Amino acid sequence: MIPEEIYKILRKQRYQIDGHTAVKLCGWVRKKMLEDKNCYKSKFYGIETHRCIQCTPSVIWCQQNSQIKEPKWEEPEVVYEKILAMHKRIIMGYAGVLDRVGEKKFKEALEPKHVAISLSGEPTLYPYLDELIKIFHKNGFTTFVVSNGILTDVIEKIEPTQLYISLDAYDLDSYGGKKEYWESILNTLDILKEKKRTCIRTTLIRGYNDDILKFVELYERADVHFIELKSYMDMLQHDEILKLAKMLDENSSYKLIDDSEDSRVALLQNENRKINPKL
């Protein structure tokens, strides 16, 4: 169901695939199992690294960024089982190091508690996203979803534990891309303040996104809970990420509260809608 050329690029990325769905074990998972080390997910939000699933219901289908037409989306309950089963397979690999990992951590990994729907493509294109999220919630999972915000309608209804909107551009022109899309993204932004828990993530790149203060108008407009400034990976270095985070902090309502060198990412918090980043 996927061009053998794209596939070999995904497998090379350690992607597990099944139909229009994919899952990948966060590179930080081994570090947790063996070295007992935690990732920025554990640092920013209190999520158990080894009990987190990274996935996506739409592997290679996304509007912005493509000649491949959308597939026959499978029902939510089947997407759910495919994700859990694919994650299980990777975690099965740790069976051979049980004497290193320990039965406690292995058992905990065989029973994930969090799921990040941010692996690849645009999650909202999957028509049964909302039901899928509700299913994960029904089974004890907290949910994090990342979206380009183009499909305002789908966002307004989904109720994940945390919703992310990736906003790598600050205006019509800076946005390839089509202006109609950006017209949809703005509406979405205007509704975000209504949701339980939001965050805008921006991946900056030299001479491309650096002018951080350019986002302030939108960041203030969106009026979200958190801002995540991340180094795309000439790629910005942590200190450059921290400095930029400082400028933002001194020119908006969002204040710097955390960061993670290992992942080159800074977390800012809406001074007006302060919620604990810890789940």
Task: Give the span between the Cα atoms of 124 and 150, in whole angstroms.
Answer: 9
Residue 267: domain span:
1-279
Give the number of residues written for the chain: 279
Residue 26 marked as a ligand binder: yes
Do residues 10 and 17 lie in contact, with contact meaning Cβ atoms separated by under 8 Å?
Answer: yes
E strands in the chain: 16-18, 21-24, 52-56, 114-117, 142-147, 162-166, 198-204, 226-231, 254-260, 265-270
49: its two tokens: 């690294």
Experimental method: X-ray
Q: Return the half-sphere exposure (C-beta side, CA atoms, 13 A cut-off) of residue 211.
A: 8
What are phi and psi for residue 227, nearest 5 degrees? -125, 135
Please name the helix (run of DSSP H) or strand (run of DSSP E) that holds residue 256, with its range, or none. Answer: strand 254-260
Name the DSSP class of 97: G
Compute the half-sphere exposure of residue 263: CA atoms within 13 Å on the CB side of its CA: 20
Domain count, the chain: 1
Question: Alpha carbon 203 to chain centroid distance?
Answer: 12
Residue 199 annotated as lining a ligand binding site = no
- In our burial notation (b when 16+ CB lie closer than 10 A, e otherwise), range 88-114 reads eebbeebeeeeeebeeebbebbeebbb
CA distance 246 to 177: 29
Element (H, E) at 224: none
Q: How far apart (Å, rounded) are the C-alpha atoms in residues 29 and 262?
A: 13
What single letter denotes the amino acid at residue 11?
Answer: R
To what resolution in angstroms was this structure determined? 2.4
Per-residue tokens: 141: 């999972």
Q: Give the DSSP H or E segment for 80.
A: helix 76-92
The domain that contains 112 carries what CATH number? 3.20.20.70
